[PDB]
Structures are given as C-alpha cells and as structure tokens.
C-alpha cells in the first residue's frame, strides 16, 4: 500500500545479486567482471471507482 | 447520458497519432520504494575456529 | 574481491539511488563465499581418500551414513523418519570418536527440515516431542542442533564469476557433483562438531570507492582474504541417499 | 533551453485552441461542448558528449 | 514458466499440489493434505531467502474447517494448533490461516 | 527545443601511470522539434 | 506528409522555393529570388498565428 501523485502507473526496480571472484597479484578488477541485473515491475493504476 | 465534449486529456488526437489508447499522454512515475534482493544469512560464522 | 562499475551517464538518468544497496550486495556475496567454502571443506573431510582418512592412523573415521534409496523415501513424512532415526546413528558414530557431546550441529536442506517436521505432525508422531508446529521449527534433534541452510552444494568463490548456472573455471573449495562419496546428487545433510572446520584470516574485510575518469565511472570494491581447510576429520560426517542399484 | 533531473526523456504537452458561441437563455452548455484536443511532443536526451 | 522470476535464480511462485479432489471429498481427508502441504510451501519459501514471520495462508472457510476436522480427536494423535472450544486454528506452521 | 541535464561541467584527473593531467569537459542534452508549424525552409528547384 | 502538424488545421513547414541555381548565376540576381521569397515566407508564417 504505497502511495504516489499524478502518475498512470508505477514503476519498481529490482536488484539481482552479485558473484565474488579472486583476483590474482597483478590481474585487473576490469578483467573479470559481470555487474548486477535490474529490471522493473509495473503497477498501472486502475480508473476511478 | 455520456457528457458531451468533456475533456480527455489522455487521449493523442494529433494528424497521425492513432490516438486508440486513452491513457497515452499520462507518462508512468516512480513507485515508492526499489525492490531489493533477500539478505543471506550466514550461518558457519559461530560454528567453528 | 567483488566489485561494481557505475556509469555518470546512466547514474543521471536513474531516478533512485543504488550506491548504498550495491555496497550491500558485494559484501554479502564475500561472506557467501566463506559459508560455500567452510561447508564444502565439511565435506571434503568426509570425501578424503582411504588412504588419507585420518590425522593419526586410529584417532578417527569421517564416517558416511545411509538414510534410503531417494525412491523409496520420496514421501515427505517418511523421508523425516528415517533422517530422526539416523541422526540417531550420527550422535553414536561420533561419540564412538570420543567427540565431546554438545557442540555439535547439523547442517541440511530446508527441503529434508520440512521433511522431520512431517514426521513429527499429529498425523504421523504419536506424542509431542522436539519441533514446536506453530513456529514450524524443530528444536535441537539429539546432540545435533539442526541448522537449515539454502545454500549447500555450493562452494568457495573461483577465478571468474559464473553467470547464473555456470560453473567457476578454477573453484577452490568445491562441492563434488558426481564424486565418490557424499556428493552433490545423493545428500541430506552434514552433522559436525565445533573442532572439525577452521578458518584463517588476514586483511579483514575492506571497502574501498574509486573514480574512473576515463571511463567517466564511479567504482565500488569490496575484498578479504582468508584460508579455509578442514582439520580434525574425525569430527565429520554426512547423511546421503542410497546410490541408485545399476 | 528547458532542464530536466534524472529523466530518460521530457514529454512538451500542447494545447489546441477553443471557439467561443452565443448561449441564448434557456440553452445548456453541455449541449454546445467541441472540447480542446491535445497531443503530445517527447524529445529524449542523447549519450554523454 | 518464461516469466516466473524476476531475476533467474530469484524463486518460484510453487503452486503445489493436493490430490485429485475425487477422493479428497471428505474434509478431514482435506485437511490432511492442506497442513502436509502447508510443510513444504514453508520450505519452498525459505528456499528462496523469503524472511521468515509475516506470512499468511489465504483460504475459502470450507477448507478452514477442513483443517479443524483434521485436528480433531478422532484423527490427530495429539493436540495441537487448532482449539475445539471455539474452532480457530493457530498459525499452522510459519504461515497465518485467514479464512 | 532542448533539453539539458547535468548542464555543463568539466573535471580534472591526475593520470599518475603517464605523469600527466587529463582535463574534459561533458553535457548531456537532447534536442528536438516541437511546433513544427513555426519552421520553414527555402530550397533549390530540381 | 501525414504527420506534419501538431494537430489538424495548426500549420505547416511550408516548404517554398528559389527556382533552380543554374539560371541564377551573378550573387546580385540571387538576392532577387530569396527576398521576393521571403514575402510568402513571412505571409506563410503570419496565417499560423506565429
């Protein structure tokens, strides 16, 4: 039950968790990495009732 | 019956908009909160060494 | 390390702010890597060679344990019965090691701690005993306490980051999918005392933020570094499930 | 020259006029309504420069 | 089954089974069944990291007697959850029972 | 029309592995073609 | 052709034209054809309530 103003909908992102690694002495950071999936979820509101 | 000449203004009109959807010009907000992964507990941290 | 690379042009579109949950997330996925590897060290007590069993030929045996043949036993509540039955058989196995009593605990599936919470339903258990039903926990089963954790079959962190399924290229503390004993397919759960893993540590746990200005990007790292290795096998063990008649 | 925070793209609304008519007593409003037609023009921002 | 998750490797809706409902027409063979399989929905949960309290099990009231048939002296060994004094069942596993 | 966000601003790097200093300068802003009945144009016949 | 306007009957580009650039040769005559040009440019313009 959250609320908002003057919007057709709302928007939620999501965060997807992350992997660790070993970084060997002189390996880079930029080398191995993956990042963090996102994505939304969608709550259009309905008309007027 | 139905109100004659009220004002929508959802709908596109415009020369070639489709203009069928009558929610187009309202743009979607920002929901209250992101959405965020479950934390992991560790359990072995108090279980050994 | 885990790390993350926030781009400026991407962090202004945003309309929320993600810098204080990804610190979060990186620090928690390094202390996954420590449960993974401790609990498959577990294991690898339990999986050592015959001829490597033990620290001193006669302290000790890792000791292995059956509890069905995983077809038989597919009915949940049965299932729970012969986990009790066999927990039973855990605290002798170890105590026939000298193992002090207490300290000791249990670490399985939440799908097998479903299963003794089955068995010890009014429908099946003729009197009350152990788990509390209201709370859907059972409590201290023998001298194991039982532990519920999601994340078994899983091990240390590796040389590269696996995409969702994939497998790390070089693991150090690894889960064997199909080894000898005690493997990935055929395990309930694995029963321990308090001297039978250790881990060493140097450097703590450190967080640390950069600027990437060539690449007009903020960075976020987070890094440790500890050893993990098993000592005192006699103290291991295993439940697993009755390989498959060929 | 118009500024938007932390936005994909900035949606212009516009507005298309109104034409006034004699309401002799005894007349409802409702009975004479056109109302006012809108559409919309999004420009959306580029990558870094 | 394309869409289920958020992220892969997030979880499951889990929509479980019961029985065939031919031969679950009698409510304390229901009700069995429901709190059997109230078990397992507690450990899919807990599978995906969900946190454990502040969790509910909606259901029709018929099923809702189906669970205090189910409890009753005649089928349970021992008492527990339910009360016949006033037949309200009280929080079957981690989950609440709302009729 | 155009729309700006962040305006314009510039920033300075120390690039210690070359002993040298990077200065850049960045916007991000986007344009557009609102109210096309006030535009024209003059052209060459074919 | 289609989408040119904002809304039916609010205006156009009005596109226009100069009469080619080969026939049009010295700078001086040039001027002729853009200027006389600009008449309906500005009356073109002014029919849109610009």
């Given at each position: 039950?959250?609320?908002?103003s003057?919007?057709?909908?709302a928007?939620?992102?999501?965060?997807?968790?992350?992997?660790?690694?070993?970084?060997?002495?002189?390996?880079?950071?930029?080398d191995?990495?993956?990042?963090?999936?996102?994505?939304e979820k969608?709550?259009?509101?309905?008309?007027?009732? | 019956?139905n109100?004659?000449?009220?004002?929508?203004?959802?709908?596109?009109?415009?020369?070639?908009?489709?203009?069928?959807?009558?929610?187009?010009?309202?743009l979607?907000?920002?929901?209250?909160?992101?959405?965020?992964?479950?934390?992991?507990?560790?359990?072995?941290?108090?279980?050994?060494m | 390390?885990?790390?993350?690379?926030?781009?400026?042009?991407?962090?202004?579109?945003?309309?929320?702010?993600?810098?204080?949950?990804?610190?979060?997330?990186?620090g928690?996925?390094?202390?996954?890597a420590?449960?993974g590897?401790?609990?498959?060290?577990?294991?690898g007590?339990?999986?050592?060679?015959?001829?490597?069993?033990?620290?001193?030929?006669?302290?000790?045996?890792?000791?292995?344990?059956?509890?069905?043949?995983?077809?038989?036993?597919?009915?949940?509540?049965?299932?729970?019965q012969?986990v009790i039955?066999?927990?039973?058989?855990?605290?002798?196995?170890?105590?026939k090691?000298?193992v002090?009593?207490?300290d000791?605990?249990?670490?399985?599936?939440?799908?097998?701690?479903?299963?003794?919470?089955?068995?010890?339903?009014?429908?099946?258990?003729?009197?009350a005993?152990?788990?509390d039903?209201?709370?859907?926990?059972?409590?201290?089963?023998?001298?194991?306490?039982?532990?519920?954790?999601?994340?078994?079959?899983?091990?240390?962190?590796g040389?590269?980051?696996?995409?969702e399924?994939?497998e790390?290229?070089?693991?150090?503390?690894?889960?064997?999918?199909?080894?000898?004993?005690?493997?990935?397919?055929?395990?309930?759960?694995?029963?321990?005392h308090?001297?039978?893993?250790?881990?060493?540590?140097?450097?703590?746990?450190?967080?640390?933020?950069?600027r990437?200005?060539?690449?007009?990007?903020?960075?976020?790292?987070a890094?440790?570094?500890?050893?993990?290795g098993?000592?005192?096998?006699?103290?291991?063990?295993?439940?697993?499930f009755?390989?498959?008649?060929?």
């Amino acid at each position: 039950q959250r609320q908002i103003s003057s919007g057709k909908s709302a928007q939620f992102p999501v965060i997807g968790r992350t992997k660790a690694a070993y970084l060997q002495p002189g390996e880079s950071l930029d080398d191995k990495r993956k990042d963090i999936k996102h994505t939304e979820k969608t709550i259009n509101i309905d008309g007027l009732l | 019956a139905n109100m004659q000449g009220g004002q929508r203004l959802g709908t596109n009109q415009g020369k070639g908009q489709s203009a069928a959807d009558k929610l187009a010009l309202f743009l979607k907000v920002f929901g209250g909160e992101v959405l965020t992964a479950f934390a992991r507990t560790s359990v072995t941290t108090n279980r050994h060494m | 390390t885990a790390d993350v690379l926030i781009y400026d042009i991407e962090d202004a579109m945003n309309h929320y702010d993600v810098r204080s949950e990804y610190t979060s997330q990186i620090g928690e996925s390094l202390a996954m890597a420590a449960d993974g590897a401790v609990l498959a060290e577990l294991a690898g007590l339990v999986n050592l060679a015959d001829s490597v069993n033990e620290n001193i030929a006669g302290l000790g045996k890792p000791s292995l344990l059956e509890v069905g043949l995983k077809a038989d036993l597919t009915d949940p509540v049965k299932l729970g019965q012969a986990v009790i039955a066999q927990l039973t058989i855990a605290r002798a196995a170890l105590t026939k090691n000298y193992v002090p009593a207490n300290d000791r605990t249990f670490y399985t599936t939440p799908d097998v701690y479903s299963a003794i919470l089955a068995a010890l339903m009014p429908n099946a258990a003729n009197y009350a005993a152990l788990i509390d039903p209201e709370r859907g926990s059972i409590r201290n089963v023998m001298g194991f306490e039982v532990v519920e954790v999601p994340h078994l079959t899983a091990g240390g962190a590796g040389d590269d980051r696996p995409d969702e399924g994939a497998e790390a290229t070089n693991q150090k503390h690894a889960f064997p999918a199909a080894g000898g004993k005690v493997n990935k397919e055929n395990v309930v759960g694995l029963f321990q005392h308090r001297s039978a893993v250790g881990t060493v540590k140097l450097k703590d746990l450190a967080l640390e933020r950069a600027r990437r200005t060539e690449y007009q990007a903020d960075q976020i790292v987070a890094k440790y570094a500890m050893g993990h290795g098993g000592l005192r096998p006699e103290s291991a063990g295993a439940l697993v499930f009755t390989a498959a008649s060929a």
